[PDB]
């Protein structure tokens, strides 16, 4: 089978750089006949499937910016792409066609640098239907920021920091290159209801105060 | 527009069986030759077999870790490709796709894929979610936007599809992925709409949950 | 044809308000008296309130338990009567019909009545149904008659509205009353077919529960 | 406020009889200058609403049988059905609108007497799904019986019949006059995983045997 490698394995650029990334293969994918290299780049956005970008490794399927240019030869080959947009971020996958079995390499990832951006928060208290199941999840978001470290703190009556929380950040996203991130602090009911309190504080290294999102069970 | 949708993925034990299909459209789906390609995090992409024209006894090559266990299969009158799957392994779970081998006699290049269907082969057992509202704890105190939530809890395997409004409400969500827990998973997603939609109008969270065949709308209320 | 849909029943707590609308087609609604009539196991039928014609500035009257509590209005534009209620009760439980007062000046018989939405007043929580398919032991030995199944478990209040392939299939079907237990209800949905429809087609268990606005869609698998 | 008072509160017949029932008011429901009764008929089928069967009295509604007859005057009436069909079953109600408030009688609930059938039984196992709760609710549907009292027994592994069962019966059916019932044996998994063979059985008051269903966990 040919064995196909791709370098590096990411990469992180930020909007109007170029990039290169490379993909080599165990024997030549050239048909000295045609003197056409069987060679195919896939682009696979954030919960997309992979799309064709270039073909004979360097012919572009119909619809792809120019920025984007296939070249090399024989087991050395190239994706480039002279300015990278936002949009661009992606897994890209080089792929042979000389022989059966067809065959891939392990992709270079594509992230984005961008500019520091601050999150959206919201937080909400358990849903009462899940009460009625005894389970109290407290949960919050944390949309569209940057960079992805960012530290979520719970507090239970104001300042008593908890941690039975579970995090889970997106993908970057494709168009303005930020992260999302939920945080849900999940406890029994009967702990729940011994509290009145609940504030959810995004903070990232700064001198800047953290954002901050409370309610209070005694609304109700 | 050309478009191939897969359907069929769910839970298998190892040893079991599971027949996906990709229905094609846009196209004259007679004329090409068709690939299933699986996807998982251990081995990247990974074709699995292709089958070619009427003319050429619809021929069919495969992957060396699926041949004598897998078939693809064709069927021109309802421009559809299937997979059919016996003796299923932990190692054949994945993301199935379906593609479009290119026109062109000797380009193989698979120039249309499907969104893919989801195969997990394990021996737990299959799970429905919960799926709880998440409306802001007061619906008169707003701001210019409003954001909405929806918890999907205690499910497996994954994956599970969110909606709002049927997928009219596309714009301004966040669907998390989801976080394993004692054996179970947990997603949230939360959409953020004007505050002149919400409480003014019906917002509704949809789950979809394939491998346990549930739909479940919950209505997001004050 | 003529007909009356009411909607906005649900679960309220004593003391509480809720809102119920009836949409009326098939007649010139504008021409037409309106009432609401109420039903419960330990009062029986009771007529609520009236509302007349525009000419007559909308005149109403009530019946002596709800005045003061309750507003009858409609909307001929919207084709619709409203009951408003306040300061909700215990003994304001039961099922709401609108209903069209006959035509002539003098007749106030009902003539045509909608099917009606449920309305309970308590303290306790709403709590969503679990909902889980029954199918027979064994999908190839059969009889030339199927029949399958569809548990409703564990929600609070009552109704529930079980339907089977959206309502497509509705002969031989079996719904049968909830039985309260630890005060949660629970109840099985029976529905019968020739043994050609299962597991040849695909059978679908829908349940709607008003009160939590929750639709869960179950598919029978073998 | 009018009272009104019918009888009798329930009969019972069997296709083709002539059923009578009474509405009786406690002031005359007559409008002596246009020499009307003020009084109508509803008719309740199972599952439905109310439809309006006689108004004035006398007078049908389009669309009703004219095997139903009001008559009667000024406190007393009368509801006839001369030859009462399967489809009949329901309850009936008069309602006064001489004066308001407008109200209501009881209702004389008409059920229907049929020959004896047999039910239908069909036994299912607990759902899959719902052994993933910890429950295992073991149904049996009696379906399309008359008379309405049936005997469900629930037997586990071989005639050790069992109890901890829910049983819940329909209306009778408005076509065919028969009753249908669910019988449902809940225990939890580990008792339902004990044992092997799972059978329902129906009887009623008879020398002919039981129908019996059944199942048995090894069959996986």
């Known amino acids: 089978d040919i064995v196909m490698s791709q370098s590096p394995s990411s990469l992180a650029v930020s909007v109007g750089e170029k990039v290169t990334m490379t993909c080599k293969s165990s024997?030549?994918?050239?048909?000295?006949?045609?003197?056409?290299?069987?060679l195919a780049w896939y682009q696979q956005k954030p919960g997309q499937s992979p799309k064709l970008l270039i073909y004979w490794a360097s012919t572009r399927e119909s619809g792809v910016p120019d920025r984007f240019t296939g070249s090399g030869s024989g087991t050395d080959f190239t994706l480039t792409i002279s300015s990278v947009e936002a949009e661009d971020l992606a897994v890209y996958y080089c792929?042979?066609?000389?022989?059966?079995?067809?065959?891939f390499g392990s992709g270079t990832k594509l992230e984005i640098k961008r500019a520091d951006a601050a999150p959206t928060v919201s937080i909400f208290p358990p849903s009462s239907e899940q009460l009625t199941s005894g389970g109290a999840s407290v949960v919050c978001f944390l949309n569209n920021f940057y960079p992805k470290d960012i530290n979520v703190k719970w507090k239970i009556d104001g300042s008593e920091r908890q941690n039975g929380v579970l995090n889970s950040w997106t993908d970057q996203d494709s168009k303005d290159s930020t992260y999302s991130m939920s945080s849900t602090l999940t406890l029994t009911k009967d702990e729940y209801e011994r509290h009145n309190s609940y504030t959810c504080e995004a903070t990232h290294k700064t001198s800047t105060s953290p954002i901050v999102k409370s309610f209070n069970r005694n609304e109700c | 527009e050309v478009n191939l949708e897969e359907s069929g993925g769910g839970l298998v034990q190892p040893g079991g069986s599971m027949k996906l299909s990709c229905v094609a459209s846009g196209f004259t789906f007679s004329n090409y030759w068709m690939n299933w390609v699986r996807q998982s995090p251990e081995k990247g992409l990974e074709w699995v077999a292709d089958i070619r024209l009427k003319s050429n006894n619809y021929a069919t090559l495969y992957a060396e870790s699926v041949k004598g266990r897998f078939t693809i299969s064709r069927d021109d009158s309802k421009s559809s490709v299937y997979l059919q799957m016996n003796n299923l392994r932990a190692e054949d779970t994945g993301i199935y796709y379906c593609?479009?081998?290119?026109?062109?006699?000797?380009?193989?290049?698979?120039?249309?894929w499907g969104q893919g269907t989801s195969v997990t082969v394990s021996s737990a057992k299959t799970t429905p979610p919960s799926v709880y509202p998440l409306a802001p704890g007061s619906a008169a105190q707003t701001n210019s936007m409003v954001t909405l939530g929806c918890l999907v809890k205690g499910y497996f395997p994954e994956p599970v599809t969110v909606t709002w409004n049927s997928g009219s409400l596309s714009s301004g969500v966040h669907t998390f992925p989801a976080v394993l827990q004692s054996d179970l998973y947990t997603l949230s997603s939360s959409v953020t709409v004007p505050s002149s939609p919400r409480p003014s109008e019906t917002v509704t969270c949809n789950v979809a949950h394939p491998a346990s065949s549930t739909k479940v709308d919950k209505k997001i209320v004050p | 044809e003529v007909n009356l849909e009411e909607s906005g029943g649900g679960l309220v707590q004593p003391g509480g308000s809720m809102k119920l609308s009836c949409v009326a087609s098939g007649f010139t609604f504008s021409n037409y008296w309106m009432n609401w009539v109420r039903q419960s196991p330990e009062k029986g039928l009771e007529w609520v309130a009236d509302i007349r014609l525009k000419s007559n500035n909308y005149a109403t009257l009530y019946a002596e338990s709800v005045k003061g509590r309750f507003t009858i209005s409609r909307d001929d534009s919207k084709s619709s009567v409203y009951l408003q209620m306040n300061n909700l009760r215990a003994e304001d439980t039961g099922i709401?019909?609108?209903?069209?007062?006959?035509?002539?000046?003098?007749?106030?018989?009902?003539?045509?009545?909608?099917?009606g939405t449920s309305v309970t007043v308590s303290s306790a929580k709403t709590t969503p149904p679990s909902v889980y398919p029954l199918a027979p032991g064994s999908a190839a030995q059969t009889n030339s008659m199927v029949t399958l199944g569809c548990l409703v478990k564990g929600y609070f209040p009552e109704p529930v509205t079980v339907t089977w392939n959206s309502g497509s299939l509705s002969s031989g079907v079996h719904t049968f009353p909830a039985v309260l237990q630890s005060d949660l209800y629970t109840l099985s949905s029976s529905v019968t077919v020739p043994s050609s429809p299962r597991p040849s087609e695909t059978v679908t268990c829908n349940v709607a529960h008003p009160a939590s606005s929750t639709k869960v869609d179950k598919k029978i698998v073998p | 406020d009018i009272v009104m008072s019918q009888s009798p509160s329930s009969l019972a017949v069997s296709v083709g009889e002539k059923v009578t029932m009474t509405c009786?008011?406690?002031?005359?429901?007559?409008?002596?200058?246009?020499?009307?009764?003020?009084?109508?008929?509803y008719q309740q089928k199972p599952g439905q609403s109310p439809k309006l069967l006689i108004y004035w009295a006398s007078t049908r509604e389009s669309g009703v049988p004219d095997r139903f007859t009001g008559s009667g005057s000024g406190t007393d009436f009368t509801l006839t059905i001369s030859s009462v069909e399967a489809e009949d079953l329901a309850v009936?109600?008069?309602?006064?609108?001489?004066?308001?408030?407008?109200?209501?009688?009881?209702g004389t609930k008409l059920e229907i007497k049929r020959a004896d059938a047999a039910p239908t039984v069909s036994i299912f196992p607990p759902s899959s799904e719902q052994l993933t709760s910890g429950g295992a609710s073991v149904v049996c549907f009696l379906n399309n019986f008359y008379p309405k009292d049936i005997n469900v027994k629930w037997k586990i592994d071989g005639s050790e019949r069992q109890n901890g069962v829910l049983n819940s019966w329909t209306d009778q059916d408005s076509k065919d006059s028969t009753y249908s019932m669910s019988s449902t044996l809940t225990l939890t998994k580990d008792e339902y995983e004990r044992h092997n063979s799972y059978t329902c059985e129906a009887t009623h008051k008879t020398s002919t045997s039981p129908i019996v269903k059944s199942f048995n966990r090894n069959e996986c």
């Open positions: 593609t479009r081998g290119a026109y062109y006699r000797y380009d193989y290049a698979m120039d249309y």
């Open positions: 024997q030549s994918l050239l048909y000295s006949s045609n003197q056409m290299n069987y």
């Open positions: 792929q042979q066609y000389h022989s059966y079995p067809f065959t």
